[PDB]
Structures are given as structure tokens and as C-alpha cells.
Design a protein around this nucleic acid. Sequence first.
RNA 1: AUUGAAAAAAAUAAUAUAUAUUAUAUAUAUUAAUUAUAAAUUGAAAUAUGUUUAAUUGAAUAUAUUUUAGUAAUAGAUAAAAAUAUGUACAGUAAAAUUGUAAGGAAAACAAUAAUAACUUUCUC
RNA 2: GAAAGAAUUAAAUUAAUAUAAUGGUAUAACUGUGCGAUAAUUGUAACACAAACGAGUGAAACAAGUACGUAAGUAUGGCA
Lengths: 274, 348, 113, 93, 64, 93
Amino acid sequence: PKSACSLVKPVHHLVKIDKSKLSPRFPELKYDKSDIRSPGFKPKDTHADRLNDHYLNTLQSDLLLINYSHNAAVVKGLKQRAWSGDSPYHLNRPPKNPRGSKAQLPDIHPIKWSNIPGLESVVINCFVREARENQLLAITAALQLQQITGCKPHPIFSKNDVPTWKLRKGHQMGAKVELKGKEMSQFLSTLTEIVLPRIREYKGISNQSGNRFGGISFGLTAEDIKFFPEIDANQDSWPKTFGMHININTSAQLDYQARTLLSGFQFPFFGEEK
Amino acid sequence: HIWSDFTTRPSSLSIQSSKVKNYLFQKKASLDPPSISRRSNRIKYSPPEHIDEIFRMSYDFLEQRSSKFYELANKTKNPLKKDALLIKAEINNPEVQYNFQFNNKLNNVKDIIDYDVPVYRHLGKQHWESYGQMLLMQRLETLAAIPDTLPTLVPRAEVNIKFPFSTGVNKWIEPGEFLSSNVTSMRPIFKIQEYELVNVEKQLYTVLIVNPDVPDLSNDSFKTALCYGLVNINLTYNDNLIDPRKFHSSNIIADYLPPVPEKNAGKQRFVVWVFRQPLIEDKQGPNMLEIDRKELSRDDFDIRQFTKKYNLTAIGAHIWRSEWDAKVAAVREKYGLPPGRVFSRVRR
Amino acid sequence: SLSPLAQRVVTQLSVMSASRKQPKLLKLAREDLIKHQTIEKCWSIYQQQQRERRNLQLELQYKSIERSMNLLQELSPRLFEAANASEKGKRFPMEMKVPTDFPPNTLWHYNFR
Amino acid sequence: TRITLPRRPAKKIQLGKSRPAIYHQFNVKMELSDGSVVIRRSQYPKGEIRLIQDQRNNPLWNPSRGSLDRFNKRYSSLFSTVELSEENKKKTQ
Amino acid sequence: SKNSVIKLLSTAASGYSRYISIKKGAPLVTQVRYDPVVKRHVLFKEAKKRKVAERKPLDFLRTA
Amino acid sequence: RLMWTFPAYFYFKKGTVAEHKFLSLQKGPISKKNGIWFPRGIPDIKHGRERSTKQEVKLVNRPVIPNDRITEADRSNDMKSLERQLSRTLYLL
RNA sequence: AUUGAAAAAAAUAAUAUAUAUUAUAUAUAUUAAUUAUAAAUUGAAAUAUGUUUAAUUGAAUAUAUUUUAGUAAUAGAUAAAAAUAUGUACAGUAAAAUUGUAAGGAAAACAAUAAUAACUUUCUC
RNA sequence: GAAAGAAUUAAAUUAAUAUAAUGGUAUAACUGUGCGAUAAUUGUAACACAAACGAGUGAAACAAGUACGUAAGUAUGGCA
Ligand SMILES: [Mg+2]
Ligand SMILES: [Mg+2]
Ligand SMILES: [Mg+2]
Ligand SMILES: [Mg+2]
Ligand SMILES: [Mg+2]
């Protein structure tokens, strides 16, 4: 290496050169994953999604009707404030961080026909803490997740180190899986109908639960997972079983809207709302 | 059923192969694909199930859409809009897709891929944008053929060159290739494929091959050299190969002088530029233009100035680049050019 | 070499893994490929149309609501105020269930509470 | 100390050749508490399941609409409300 | 001594040789470099013998 | 066609009564055998499946029988009834 | 090529064969493979050859010849867990803090947290 | 009016850089990934910086060969 000086040279044309296309290296990779010729092809729209159809038909219109506030304008979030130029030291100064927060917050828009809240993604985080001792427990947890979802899990590793809890850094410990589209919908439907009613003293999801912006969550114990039909059908094959966190991500501007949406899909809500 | 009709619509939109067409449109998956030539391979092959009825339904749906588009298309008066409507109507036609994808676009046979047809032309443009155009742009930028000769390019026509007369071999030159002096001894052949809607009868073109890298020792820099200059060339979407057949001796503003790089003078870029003429209204037929043949010089040639003078717009480009070899002296001798200089190996 | 627990873990891992469980690649003829493309494109177009229809309907509903609320504001202020309240904790009723594949034995309940 | 499965050399999936994990799934009919059937795709091999405890018989999901068993069996002749009224004097507590 | 010196002798039998440093129990270090006697890139190999930290040969063939 | 092989070895344990029934229900793939022409290519088999083709896997104790989606009311065309259309949104006029 | 089903051909690319040229080109033919690799007295499957039942096919069972089962993670040009620290090519963005969520607690993991004016394509009033 | 793309703007170098501290680094010098494992190669090195000498530092170019890259090119160990 003669130098480390990185410096992209300017060009003399407005044509956008896709460099990937000019090579002959990865001919299978030039095709989109949606295209049949790609090895990455998967039949996406295999059957009619039921929960999605219901949302489209009944709920979406109802949600819109609920969320109509008359002549509602945009509520701007907390942003980085600029300095008043009352001193020459303000001249190339970085902007003041937001008022309360360190990070900037998004603008809350009025709900119209375009931006009605709806389900975006489900994530099922299972971090088994006994797997600090036994790596095989992580594998079993991942399998369980796969069984539940019908989707490929991704392994969670210990990102941090700590002595009090017997936890190393870079150790496989449980798994996660982001469900999207039809599989996610199915999983939600199963949760509503099969699993959550079989939980004994189940009041619902807390109203104090959630993000500030359109994200709601809750968790299932190891006792609760044995109600899933894939696990239930072979209790001999599943001696151990692991709890899980369930992060539901909506297209909701605020959290009460997201809660309302989830209620539309038969999720009970019990606590005192914020 | 608009796509089965060929009263007003061109013949090129159909598949010319009968067997293929039959395979496409059957009532059951009984026949075997014409693409698979071998019997054993056909036997082995199994198409995906239920594909026929769904395909038929899709055809009907898109055929209906095309028919609806055509209802608008005929009412439209202005030409570009009409063309766009026509494209919209026929782009999803399976037959035209088959035709375009699986037969050559460079040397298109008129019955299969007709570039007079708007849809096929649009497809060809899209194909060009996908790869060949990008490559050309890269070669222009990297080699520094744009700012050094002619500020920018907005690629509209696909330009491909060939050197058939020198050696004998058939090969379209990839942009930024190193060609031997034997290869580029006699003149090249252009193919200017135009994808925009343009007046075929009126629109003339000019073609200029320029060598920016010939050394000028007075200036201690380089100068340009117009190696080959044609003007007032007539193109047609299908009939577009610029050959000694087409252009006359009147069209040649500067007849082909070959690349003869000097020893240690370095690699010399030869970047062909294709311009379209300015089109004049209220005048039927092709509007010619006269070039002052004493004014423009070959040993030093302001391309940009020339363009400004005659009001040209660069639509296409191509580039090769030659350096010294043993046969350049022989080439010079053949052409009657002088012995050729020899420079110091060191750029001191 | 391995324990029974280790074996069972390996089996479980295999269930998830693509090792020696996946078929050959789905190769097509060119005509077949075209047919597939035409199927997919048409479908996509249909889906887009459906989305637009639904979206359009929603827009129309929104416009109607806007028209109503302006009228209400013009006429009866109290009624308008009542209409335009914060519906923060609004919950869909638990009877409005997600429509199943096939219906139940008792289709509709005529009595309640 | 840490129980593990020690890794073998990983198999090189080439770029472009990576294939999506399409797991083997059966179409499974779930009959809920009431006779409402619903089809769901499932990895376990069972074409039909009928459920006992669901949302369709839980009071939380529809508000508007075996020790005990053993006891009932072996104290059946006595028939064990009237019995509650008889044996519920609320003075002593 | 943690890092020892070694002599890499050219495989094309010129006599040309290049010297490099390695860790005491490092794998056998062969490298392809220019041999100026032959005027090409050739393999170089360790002239002397020495002990190596024996790694278990990772098995791609799935054993047992 | 693209689905994986059903991992029967997991769901059904070797040397068990449940496995045996499953095996009986199934039919195996034709293996390659030397000195024979297979005009549909040579069998590619792993975990007992022809890789070149789609796999079919055939499978209180009661058959789950779903109810008819069309109703008595629908058949009669009773407009005052609520059970008359089950797949559509009914509006009171 | 033989076999199944009921005159030919017109891309790219790969492969096979041939030749053109001080041009890694062209011509003809064909569309393979694509997540595998030794070793299994025991599991499972197929085919062949026998025998018995309702010329026949199904069904059962014996031997032979094979095939499968060694069940092991990445499926994405992966992108701030850990691992090859020098080359090159392609691509991307971190952190903190905050709001939550099964055990989880100040401290394990996962989720979420700035703005879309203009532009291109697609559908649509 | 909607969906998708291309992205742009703002912010950021507070993380990360094998290692101190400082300067530099998102156009990334940081991170991931394919190939590779070659340039952690061979002879001449001008000219500069620095500099009492001895040394030290950056390095165009010429020639031989190699690796990656469609190409342009990049590599004579490591952001310094
Ligand atoms: Mg610093
Ligand atoms: Mg000085
Ligand atoms: Mg000195
Ligand atoms: Mg470094
Ligand atoms: Mg480095």
C-alpha cells in the first residue's frame, strides 16, 4: 500500500453505472430473488392470507374512521435545534441536541387513507440463559422457534460480557426470527386462537407496554409454549422448552393506534393506558 | 382478442416459429417444448403443474388490457404519446417477449424483431440500458474520452463498430479494446441503432473518429486528430449499418487515416462520436449541410468548436485504443505516410 | 463419541438444516419460462389494481367524513364536539372475530349478556 | 465445563447459489372448540386436529356469549345450592 | 525465543534463497516469489527441518 | 416441487409402532440399479426422495369434518336472516 | 438415436467439436450440473427371481442385487457476537441515549426512535 | 391519488482503527463479503524532505515476474 487516502473521483456523465452488471462473475446473482431463474426463488403468494384479508375488508375502514380528527395538522417531533447566530462561535457549530432526548424523534402525522396503521413485522426473540452452560440448549430453542413459525431462525450470540451472570462474549444463546407477510399473520392467528386462551390467568397485553411509536410487545413462558400445536403433538420429543419475547411492529404513528389495531385482531388489553 | 388480429398490427408481434406458438397456446399440457431439441431430454423434462389454464387466464387479462389501451391509442394524435400507448398495449404480449428475449438484437432479422415497431424498439432500448450503455459510459469516463474530446454524453443511440475489410474475421469491437495496427489498417463499419422516436426520412447524422492523444512537441502536450469524418448519413431503425455501400464520396469530410501510434508516444484513444443533424421545419426532404473543407484541419481538430459551428448533438459514442507495434511502419508505408517518429522511453 | 442427548440435538439441528434434504433446481424451458413470466406479471398487475381500488375507496370514505364533519361544525357545535373526541383507548369488540376457513356449528347467537 | 457440539468445517455456499429454506409443510385442519374448522400450514405430520380449550370457548374472548371428577364419582350416592346453605354458618371465622 | 529465523530455498534449483521469520511452532511456510536466476516466480520451501504445532486435520468427510 | 424432504427420522422414531403405519402409508422412490436404462434420468436420492421431482407424503379420535359454507338460509334466499351470507359483509336496509 | 406424449432454425452464456487472424474470434450441435465427496453384523427403500392368496394385477412373504440412513448449523455478496491483522474487487454504516418486552433486576437479549421537495417506473381517479 | 425504485438532505468519525498518545479516516483509512494468499516479489532508483557525519523518511520513472479487477487500474506489507 502506497497510501490510505480515500478520495472518489468526480465523473462527467449522469448515467448510473451499475458495476455488478458489467462483471461476468455472479450470473445467478444478477437475477432478482423474485425471478424464477434465480436459485434464491421461493413461491411467495402461495395461498390467501386470512388475517390480512380480514384487515383489508373490515378493520382498515373502521380504523380510519376512529383515527379521523377534524383538521388535524402534523405534530413535529423533538429535533436537533439550531443555534441563534448571536455570537461568531455559532458559525460552524453543530446543532444543539433535542430538548428532552439525545436522539431525534419522528413527526406524528394525521391518519388518512394512505397511512392507516397495520401490521408490519413480528420478531420472536428467545434468549435462553441456561445456554451459557449448554450450547445444545440454544439449538433446541432455535428448533422450537422454527417449529412454531415455519420460518428459519437466526442464532443469537452473547454480545456483552458480565461476571455476576455467568456470561461470556461470543457464545450462541437462543435464537430469533423476523416473521413478515403471511407466516407472521398465521403466527398471530395461532397466538390469538390456540395459545393465549390456554394460558390460565391471562388478562391480556399491558396497556403500558410498547414503544413510543407503533410497536407493542409481550412474552411467553416455557409453560405457554407447550400449547403450540407443533410442540403439543409430540410432548415426548419436547422435554425442555424455552420462553420467548414477541415484538410486534406496526405501521402506527403512535402506540394507542397500534394497540387498537391489535385489538381488531382479537388481542386482549388489560392495564391502565398511558 | 386483439393479439390474434394482424389486420392493422405488424407481423413481427407474432412468433414466426409455428411449433413454439402451438406449445404456448394449447388446452392441455400434452405437447413437449420445441426448445429442448433432443428426444431423451424432452422425455426427462417435466413442466410445472397447472401452468396452462392460469397462463391462458393471464393472457386473456393482458390481452383485454392491450385492447383497452388500443382504444385510446387510435384516438391519440401526437406521435410520441401514440407510440407510448402502443408500447403499453403490446409490451406484456408473450409472443413479442419471446421474440425479443431469445433472438439476436444486434443483427436483428426484420420478421422476428422489427425496430420499426415501437414496442420492440423500447425493449431494445431497455436491454441497452441494462448493460451495454453502462459499459460504454464506464469506458468513456475511465479512459477520459469525455472531457478530453467532448464535454459530456447523453447516450441515446447504441453505436457498435467493426473492422471487416482489414483481416477477414468478424468481431464487434468491445469499447476500450486494444486493437492491432493490422486490425485497424482499413476503415471500420458503424452500426448506429436508434431507440428514440425520430423522423427517419429527414434526420441525418454525422460520424467523427477523433484521436486526442497525438503528441505536439511545440506545445509539449497533445493535440486532436480527425482520423475519419462522415456527414449527412441516413439511418433507418432496421437499415442502420454505415458501410461504403450506403455513404457516398460526397459524405466523406475526412477519409479514413489509420491509427499509426509512434514508439513510446503511448496508448492512443480513438473515440468515435455519433451526432444527429439539426432538423429544420417547413422543408420537405433531408436538410443537408456544407462543411468548409479548407477550414477544418485533420492534424489539429477542435471537435467542440466544430460541433458548435454545425449545431450538432452527440447521441452515441464508441472507443478503441491503439499503441505501437511492429506493423505500424508497414501500415504507414501502405498509406504512404512518413517513416514515423520514435520517442524516448522515459517521460522525463 | 456422542451421548443420547447429543444425538437428539444433532437430529433437531438436521430438521432445521438444508443438508441433503433439498431437491434439484427448478429448471424451465424458454416457452415455459415465458408462460411463467406472463402469469406472474398479470397477477402483480391484478394485485396493484386491487390495492388502488381499496385505496381509492378509503380516500372516498375519508372525503365523505371530512364533508360530514364540516357540515356538523356549521350546524350544531355540540354535536360536532361530541363527534370529534379522542378515541385513544378504543378497543374492537371481542365478538368481531377473524373470519375462519369454515363456519361453526352455531352460526349466529341471537341471545347475549 | 461448557457443554458444546464442536463445529466441523463449514460448507461453502457460493454467491448466487444460496437457496431459500422451504421446509416440508402439511395443510392441517384445526377444528376449534366449536365446529369452526380452519386450515393452517404446519410442519408436524397430522392432517386433522380438534382443540378443546380455544378462544371460541374462553370467557375473555367472548364475554357476551381430574381430582374434582374423581370426588364427584366417589361421592355420587350422596349427591353432595341447598348443601352449601346447610353447611355455611358465618358466625365463626 | 518466540520468533525464529528460517531459510526458504528456491524449488527451481538455482541456489537462490530468501530468509524469513516465523513463530516457533508455525506451519511449514512455503511461498511463491521471484527467483532472479531463473527470472520467474517459483516455489520456495524450508531447507532445514523443524518441529511444528500439530493441528488436527479438519475433516470435511462427515465422520461417524 | 421446491420443498425439502420430510425429515421422517425426527417425527417418527426408528423401531416404533407409529413409524410403521407411516411407512405403510408411504411408497418409496425407485433407486438406481446397474445395467438398466432409466429414460427419465438416473434416480437422485437422499433421505429416500427423488430430488428431481415433487415429494408426496400421505398421512376424541374423530375425523374433522367441516361444515358447509353455503347455508339453509342462503338456499332459501331469506333476506331477513343473518346466516344467509357467511363470506360477505351484510348491511341492514 | 432407441423409449414417453399426441422438414428444421433464427438470443446471452456455458459445454463439445472444427477452423479464421501476427484480432481470446466465428461456425455447427446441445442446454448438463448447482450443496455433493471413503468407511455402516442393526434402520428404511427399490428392482430382479421364487412361493402363496383374489392367464391377470393387487396383497403377503423369502433370497439376491443395488439404493439410501454417517442424520451437524452459513442458504446471504452475510455487514459492528466471535473467528485469517498483508493484496485486490464489490458493498454497507457505527455508537450513545431513550421507550418497551418471559425469567431480566443499574448491569444479559430483541425490537423500535430525523426529513421526502424534486426525479424514474408501475397501477389508478 | 397510491406502490416501488433511485436516492438526496440533515446528523455522525462520540463507535471502530492489532497496540500508547496525537493527527487522519463514513469519499471511509472502519465494517462485511468473493477471489486470493499474490506486491510481507527481483535489478536500477532520479528528485525531494530531513540532515554535522553515520544514519533516517516520502518517492516519480525504467526493466523482470506475480495477484485481484469487465475495465480503469491497484498492490514493492499493515491509516500514519
Ligand atoms: Mg482521533
Ligand atoms: Mg533544509
Ligand atoms: Mg547523507
Ligand atoms: Mg490497520
Ligand atoms: Mg489495511
